From a paper:
In M. tuberculosis and M. smegmatis, the Balon homologues Rv2629 and Msmeg1130 are transcriptionally activated in response to hypoxia, increasing bacterial survival and pathogenicity. To verify that some of these Balon homologues are indeed ribosome-binding proteins, we recombinantly expressed the proteins Rv2629 and Msmeg1130 from M. tuberculosis and M. smegmatis, respectively. We then determined their structures bound to M. smegmatis ribosomes. We found that both Rv2629 and Msmeg1130 bind the ribosomal A site and share several structural characteristics with Balon that are discussed in detail below, including the absence of aeRF1-like NIKS and GGQ motifs and insertions in the decoding site-binding and the EF-Tu-binding sites. Msmeg1130 (M. smegmatis) and Rv2629 (M. tuberculosis) inhibited protein synthesis as effectively as the known hibernation factor RaiA (Rv0079), causing a 15-fold reduction in the rate of protein synthesis, as assessed by the relative levels of the reporter protein GFP. In this assay, Balon homologues co-sedimented with ribosomes in the absence of EF-Tu, but EF-Tu was detected in the pellet only if Balon proteins were also present.
Here, by combining cryogenic electron microscopy, genetics and biochemistry, we identify Balon, a new hibernation factor in the cold-adapted bacterium Psychrobacter urativorans. We show that Balon is a distant homologue of the archaeo-eukaryotic translation factor aeRF1 and is found in 20% of representative bacteria. During cold shock or stationary phase, Balon occupies the ribosomal A site in both vacant and actively translating ribosomes in complex with EF-Tu, highlighting an unexpected role for EF-Tu in the cellular stress response. Unlike typical A-site substrates, Balon binds to ribosomes in an mRNA-independent manner, initiating a new mode of ribosome hibernation that can commence while ribosomes are still engaged in protein synthesis.
Residue numbers in the entry:
A (entry chain 5): 6 to 54
B (entry chain X): 4 to 195
C (entry chain Y): 2 to 86
D (entry chain Q): 2 to 127
E (entry chain 3): 1 to 48, 56 to 66
F (entry chain O): 1 to 136
Write the structure that this text describes.
Amino acid sequence: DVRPKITLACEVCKHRNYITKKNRRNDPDRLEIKKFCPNCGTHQPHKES
Amino acid sequence: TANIPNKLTANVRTRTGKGASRQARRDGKVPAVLYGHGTDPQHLELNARDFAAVLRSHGTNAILTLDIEGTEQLALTKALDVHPIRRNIQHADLLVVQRGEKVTVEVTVLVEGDATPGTLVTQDANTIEIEAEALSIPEQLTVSVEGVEAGTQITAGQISLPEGVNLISDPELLVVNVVEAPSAEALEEEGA
Amino acid sequence: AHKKGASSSRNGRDSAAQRLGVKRFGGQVVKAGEILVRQRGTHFHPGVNVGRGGDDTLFALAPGAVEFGAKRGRKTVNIVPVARP
Amino acid sequence: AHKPVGQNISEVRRNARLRRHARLRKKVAGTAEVPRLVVNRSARHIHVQLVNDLNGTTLAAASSIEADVRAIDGDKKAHSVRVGQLIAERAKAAGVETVVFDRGGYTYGGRIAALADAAREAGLKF
Amino acid sequence: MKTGIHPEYVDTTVQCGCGHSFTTRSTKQSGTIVVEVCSQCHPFYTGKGRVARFEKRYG
Amino acid sequence: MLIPRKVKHRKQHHPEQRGIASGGTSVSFGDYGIQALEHAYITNRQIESARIAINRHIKRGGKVWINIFPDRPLTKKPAETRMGSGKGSPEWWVANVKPGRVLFELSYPDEKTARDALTRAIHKLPIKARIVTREE
RNA sequence: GUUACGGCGGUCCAUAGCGGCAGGGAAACGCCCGGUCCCAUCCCGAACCCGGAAGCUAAGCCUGCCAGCGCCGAUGAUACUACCCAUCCGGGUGGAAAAGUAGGACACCGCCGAACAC
RNA sequence: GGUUCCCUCAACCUGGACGGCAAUCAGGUGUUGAGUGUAAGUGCACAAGGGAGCUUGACUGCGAGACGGACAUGUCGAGCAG
RNA sequence: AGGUAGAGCUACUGGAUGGCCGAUGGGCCCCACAGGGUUACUGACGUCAGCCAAACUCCGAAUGCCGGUAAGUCCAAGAGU
Ligand SMILES: [Zn+2]
């Protein structure tokens, strides 16, 4: 839907920590972002579910 | 030019304001201000009938001799406040001068004569700026239009001035513009 | 004249009033964090002990009395440290 | 007769440096407890000051004009280190320990950086 | 001057038919070029083989 | 008839009719003029009728100036309709006149014909007026 | 303490600006000479950076004098206005502009540092 | 978007192969008349406008003091810890 | 702290009257290109003089509003919270 809602999950513990939007035509591939994960307690890579 | 100054009587204003100037004008006086190089403002009162009498026969730039509480002062008429409808004189700015002092004065120009029959005489500049000493301001400068034909321009540089009189306004102003007489087919085409 | 048609107005919209303006005037004694001026741009710039919000709202950074000044042609809002009794 | 047509390179350098010095001043301010450290790099010498912007008065100031600094036989960078040590001694003797660096509109590096690194090594904390 | 973006720039010399010679620097990797008209040869700078076969037939 | 080439806002409030004129109260181009004495809206259909009455009385010679221009519009809504449902479309153009304002001017060689030519134009305007000159 | 001196600041940031004329290189501020060293150009040691000391005050900078352009601007009068009288006009008490006139003005104040002198 | 550093536009004049009013280049005048994703308004040349390098704070637990309000909503916020 | 009444515009955005200047074009002669001038001209740019605006402003009051202070009414406003 051009700009759908996406959810970012930690790569270590796999907890859904954030939700955001991206353009699915400008950025067709799964987003990769470093975000603070409270469960781990530090900054871990996050990937689109 | 040699001018004889005109004697006037001036009285110091007791009050000032809009409620005291209306009383003065309802009585027959005009408020005035006598400032000048002396760094000394003064709020005066002149008789309305007497002040307008000299202006009717000596132009706007008259030379006054005010008698303020017994003394004698030489003054010049700078500006006048005239009501648009009643044609009154609501105020008068007076400037103190001395003999031999050069004053920049804006005098009026009158065109006289009868040009070519098939021509129309139009005046653009009503007045020009003139520098002269305090007792030698010409009350009028005249220009003659005679034998002038068709497109012709009597620019301000051709106006003759009395000896001892300079010219402040530059010689580029167009004073009189004489042109061909408009026909009946030209009066209808204008303004529509 | 006697003939008639259909007419209407395509206007008739507006938005809610925003209540923008000066909230604390010169000489008033304020606390810390108290909103002073609400505005769109920087019509008033911050001075000493005054910050700027996300929407260009000026608040007090320290207790004191409000002062209005100018600094190189910019209208600034300042806080003076009123002395303890 | 002669008449230059355009701006000299000295004219451009002078007022473009102050143009990017005033830009720096938007955040760096000098307090009596945390003074402001000015530096004026030149093609020949270097100067520093310890400025207080609330009073508009300076407390301490070292320079390379001094006959003691000229005794060093090193290069311009070696002359900058000594200035960086002179100012630290004069600042500490005035009861000043923490300062803020105002690079003066020059690129931080070379003689500018050599002065700051010597003052950090000699007590001043910035 | 940056390292790699620029091309080669090596010394060279120029010999011309009028006996004049040069020694300059350029990008010609050969290091020497030959020029048939130069500043010295050109008539315009001095104030002033089709014909070979043309004279080889008529005279 | 005079119409401006364009105006930003086509439907405007009514011009205020208070006070006397702040400027343009003297003759600047011609030798004679018409000075207003009360407030009114002077439509462009009365300006055109006034300057033709001047032209016919002087026939050939002389020049005519008009110092007021119909900028401001007035709107009339369609006939025989109730109140409400929008605002009417502009219908005629007016010029806010205040006492003291000089409307027309004229420069003609003699006096009688020039003075009587202006009186014919006064009888076409919805106001009272008088003839004024350049002298003090 | 003195100077045609060099930095850092200020003022309800032009009364300070623009322009014209004539002048200065003691120390400093600059132009200036190079690209071996840190560093740099979306190409160029032009700029940023570094190492210097042949020439010059021709420019920046600084000093003195000009009111041509900009800037500031009274007094008084007027427009307007609060309250009050006033049967359709107007008036009284208090406040008081904008434009314009006389004029002002080629800035003033503070902390350091230089050379000379003491 | 975050942050660090650097720059001044529009318009006009003059000289240039195609090239013209108007493309890329050079010099000069130029203090905001250009531009800010998107309406208008308030701002921004000190730049919030233009360029480049590294990055994800487009966070977690909180939040003194306030704006605005019939209520339900809505808005700003220094500062502490990770 | 404003921005109304007022006023002002060569201080921005628009409207707009009359002159002067004259590029450019139009039309013509300049035997055709090129090669100089003329018009009741459409006449840009500039400039002199007089103007207009709720959605224009280089300006700009009187009142009104927020706060402080000194008093006044005070066997009363029969006040505020
Ligand atoms: Zn995790």
